[PDB]
Amino acid sequence: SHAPVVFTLRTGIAEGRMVYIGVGGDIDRQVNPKLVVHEGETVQINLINGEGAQHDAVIDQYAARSAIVSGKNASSTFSFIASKVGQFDYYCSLPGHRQAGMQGVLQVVPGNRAEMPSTAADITRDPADLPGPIGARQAKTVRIDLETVELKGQLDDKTTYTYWTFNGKVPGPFLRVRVGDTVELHLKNAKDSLMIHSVDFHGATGPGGAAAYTQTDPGAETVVTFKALVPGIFVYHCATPSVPNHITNGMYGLLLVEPEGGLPQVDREFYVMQGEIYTVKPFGTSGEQEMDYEKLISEKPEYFLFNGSVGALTRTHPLYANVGETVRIFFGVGGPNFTSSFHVIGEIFDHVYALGSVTSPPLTGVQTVSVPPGGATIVDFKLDRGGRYVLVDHALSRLDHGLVGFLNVDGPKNDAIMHEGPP
Amino acid sequence: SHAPVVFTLRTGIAEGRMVYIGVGGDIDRQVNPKLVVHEGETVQINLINGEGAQHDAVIDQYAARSAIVSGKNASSTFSFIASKVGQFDYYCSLPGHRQAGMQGVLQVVPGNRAEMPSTAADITRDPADLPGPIGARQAKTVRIDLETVELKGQLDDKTTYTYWTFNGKVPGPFLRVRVGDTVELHLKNAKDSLMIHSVDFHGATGPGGAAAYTQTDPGAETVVTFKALVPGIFVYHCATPSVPNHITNGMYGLLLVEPEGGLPQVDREFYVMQGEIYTVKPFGTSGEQEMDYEKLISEKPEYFLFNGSVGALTRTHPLYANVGETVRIFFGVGGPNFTSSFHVIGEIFDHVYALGSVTSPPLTGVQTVSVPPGGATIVDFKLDRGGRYVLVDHALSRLDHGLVGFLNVDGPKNDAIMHEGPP
Amino acid sequence: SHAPVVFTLRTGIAEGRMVYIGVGGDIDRQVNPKLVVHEGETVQINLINGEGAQHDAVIDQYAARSAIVSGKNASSTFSFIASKVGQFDYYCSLPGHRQAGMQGVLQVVPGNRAEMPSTAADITRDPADLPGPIGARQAKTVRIDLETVELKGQLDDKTTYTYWTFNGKVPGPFLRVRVGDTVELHLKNAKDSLMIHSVDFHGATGPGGAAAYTQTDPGAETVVTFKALVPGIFVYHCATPSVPNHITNGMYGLLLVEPEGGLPQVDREFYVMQGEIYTVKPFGTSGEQEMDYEKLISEKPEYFLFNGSVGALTRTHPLYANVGETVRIFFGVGGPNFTSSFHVIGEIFDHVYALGSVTSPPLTGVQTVSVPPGGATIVDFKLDRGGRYVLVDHALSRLDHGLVGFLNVDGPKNDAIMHEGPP
Ligand SMILES: O=N[O-]
Ligand SMILES: O=N[O-]
Ligand SMILES: [Cu+2]
Ligand SMILES: [Cu+2]
Ligand SMILES: [Cu+2]
Ligand SMILES: [Cu+2]
Ligand SMILES: [Cu+2]
Ligand SMILES: [Cu+2]
Ligand SMILES: [Cu+2]
Ligand SMILES: [Cu+2]
Ligand SMILES: [Cu+2]
């Protein structure tokens, strides 16, 4: 699995004993916590040395253990599949440590993990929620309506956040026009907004990429007109100070200006954007999460996200396709600060529109592409066979801050292209 | 304005009251500070929860307010245009907090902010200070003279730093030759230098890119000859240990090696380089700033700068051009550590010379290009209309460490490419 | 030299006197430590102000000195060539400070520094250790054997670390097949492994890029068959959770799928991968280094390495080539988290295979290329002349965490391409 269930234990002294102490999640600060797991789940346990004696963790029945960690902060992660139901001791095997208190239970329960009923609006943009290709057609005047909306959203299972959005979702509406078009932009800022909002389009030519004409008071509306002079895949974002603050809170999206021919036909298109959120409390903390200004200006986020939320493209709104389809992903980074090393595990990019150029010839046969903040690209590939394909930033520590996504494709396990055993 | 006046407030207990406390700038550690602002200026207020009670900041006559912030370190920023002259109360709206002492005054003064008289040397290279296109001509021997100079310089309004430079400015002189040219380089280390200085040209072939031949004692001169074998836009930099130290202090420049044809004809060329400075005290602290080794080797800078200084390309040496003109920016990253997401707000790159290749086809219709430390690129675009165009690193938290520049182009606010109402 | 001997001194109060205190390496916590150096070494001294009085460091016989550091954490670094054998005082020139105790000895000893005798296995891959170009030949079944081995490795001179590897070295085996080939992969997990291991190939099509078929218990074997459908230079890595943990401990390599025509003829090929290691104690600490989870998940490493170790490509297994040879470097980033700015000091890349595409035309005349984690590229250049050419990540603070390599080429100092003095 690429969604392991994760527990963090720090060694320490508590309740008059030498113990394991739970760190974050549902086990924060509990001593020798019960690790509750569902049958068939992959379990990851991170052991961190708290007080500076030698330690490990061992679960006899799964032939699983950490390495021995010796000094303060020394760490060892191990994993296994929870294949047998029942109750199992995790313990420290160092002389005396089990007797002295270093012992807890892993409970493997039958059936599938139930999802926590949500407490706030779903702010996640479905990756299929974009307009299809524009027909061949003359250049013309297009009216676009955006509303800036401030609202609490479901950031994770049991954690909320005050998002700022275009039309109550992250990313914002996928905008699709043809080069030469005249865009009539209307920006309504909701009555219940505390902040002024605006929009800079990277596909617009003139002051602030429209920001100078879109500074909108709450309950007010701006109207601006601009020509789409250049074909490309452009990120748009709020441009009201603090711009980094407006971007982290959710105010980014993509503007496709099709070239005259349109893009090469493909069977299926998807909308994906990466960003960071900068919270006071670390990744995995339950409750209302709040923004930490010191962490934002110092570029030290706690969440890395596809389309606004943890589980956005795994649990709530994943990608779906059929064997033999050509797939296109519009992938942009709102940021505000981090470059994505975009990759799909189990696939290779047939075409990569380098630096989001739609007019230059695409690069071919590419594993991984750098996309900067305030940049996008286009990738396509043919699905030659079935699987769960995984979208990642290949700076892979971002898996542990919520950045993973699923492309689900129905096919047999084994075939000519990849199979168990020899040829 | 894309240069808002920024104030940071931490809530706390001080002078026997529950108060706002100034953080950085002119208001550092003052309780309930007076925020002084000039008519028309954009004002940004950063509120940070200090002691852990619920707080906001409210200014009534501007219908401006932070969000409510609950736990320690929780934060909200808000902004507005200081369109109204006089004195206005900023205060906390939570039951009792204003009575308990959470109140200060915003003073809006008529007229424009006067410039601070400078303590130290202007070390900013004018972006228009470069030699123009070489004619067509035969390859030949070219003499180049560099001087390595240690001098105190104006990092910011009230703040100085010890710069290490090529010829007293940052970046160093723009060197321009043709492929085939034999370069006769004279490097003179000034008598009053403490340090050995040198140079490595990324456009030279041989040991240390000339560094092995140019290790120059203070008060001495070395001479080195090298052939420009490959066309490109190259960074040069000091190559005396510690090389990161000599770079952060400002010893970086660009060398253009023109291809046979020369580069395409353009109306106007500009010289811009990005670097970092690693100071003991945070961004905005007045006085002599000093270098912090721990922050240098761990890649934690306080300043992100175009051409040496805060306000380099906004206040003291901004960029000027006329509507209808095609513009080329030679953009390099001295670094020493951070990759730039280079972008011009309100413009699109007609051409981007990928990884600084002068011989491969440029990519077309690009919003944003990654440039690594020790790398450079060329961008160009036609100025279809007038406005303030803004050079940024689209890692936009670097806005709050000094990274912003202006390209000023005279023209009407409203026109066919972007305008106020509908069509 | 581009590998200086480095000493850090913090000023403070110890043993009843105002003194210098050693930081890190052989001098950690020693007062006025003896700085022992071999004749001809380049010496870098980092002064850090500890207690807040004014300090410098002066060595009279070498005309060498720091600048004056005033505030706590204020830093100045200086360098010189230890050209003179004997004992030289380093001392603070501020009034009284020398008399108050700020004085130590620099000892310069004749002859070269002996290498320290290792304690653990050599785990660095020789950059020359790769199979050469495959003939022209028909597509066929190729069998590959990989063994996952956990073992202590010589990380630095007197520091060790528990590495996880493919076949006992970092990077893993260079895999070379022809496009159209069928790969029969055998992965054996050694009996003495604590952990499950696996492999994902970025050049395989299907679930986990083979990870879904290769989750192998200790003392077990897995077998998977897959078709090489795309030509490219692909990273492969372990894909057992924690994937970031498995990668940082050393489980990455390169798979070249040759195109039918082969890569261009070249005189000499090399294998180089860049990674990070996240240790509890800082770079330079002797003894057993252990893994720091908190540093891994927050992207804050202590070691930046080519091919597994400090000195990997300078002392133990450097690169050798001859003047006039065309050279190819296959360069990959295992990571797990940092984008490399790959540069060879003294050279310029004739060709850069952008995003590791082997089917799109290579870019020409490039100084420096961004390679993401889980990305790879090919550079080639002609060696016109002799020198030590230096492999670096141009994020040059990484010089101070172990990231440097040597390409040694026998030839004269002075020729027509680069010489001392004028024409
Ligand atoms: O295979 N990439 O995580
Ligand atoms: O050439 N720079 O390391
Ligand atoms: Cu124990
Ligand atoms: Cu906004
Ligand atoms: Cu932008
Ligand atoms: Cu209050
Ligand atoms: Cu220098
Ligand atoms: Cu360099
Ligand atoms: Cu002193
Ligand atoms: Cu592994
Ligand atoms: Cu991968």
Author numbering:
A (entry chain C), B (entry chain B), C (entry chain A): 26 to 448
Text taken from the publication that reported this structure:
Copper-containing nitrite reductases (CuNiRs) are found in all three kingdoms of life and play a major role in the denitrification branch of the global nitro­gen cycle where nitrate is used in place of di­oxy­gen as an electron acceptor in respiratory energy metabolism.
Intriguingly, three T2Cu sites belonging to the trimer in the asymmetric unit are occupied by different ligands: two by the substrate nitrite and one by a diatomic molecule consistent with it being the product nitric oxide. Each of these independent sites have full occupancy of copper and the ligand. The product may have formed from enzyme turnover catalyzed by solvated electrons generated during X-ray data collection, but the full occupancy of a single species is surprising. This suggests a very slow off-rate for dissociation of the product which is consistent with the lower NiR activity in these enzymes. The observation of side-on NO binding geometry seen here adds to the gathering evidence that this geometry is energetically stable at the T2Cu site of CuNiR and is an intrinsic part of the catalytic turnover.
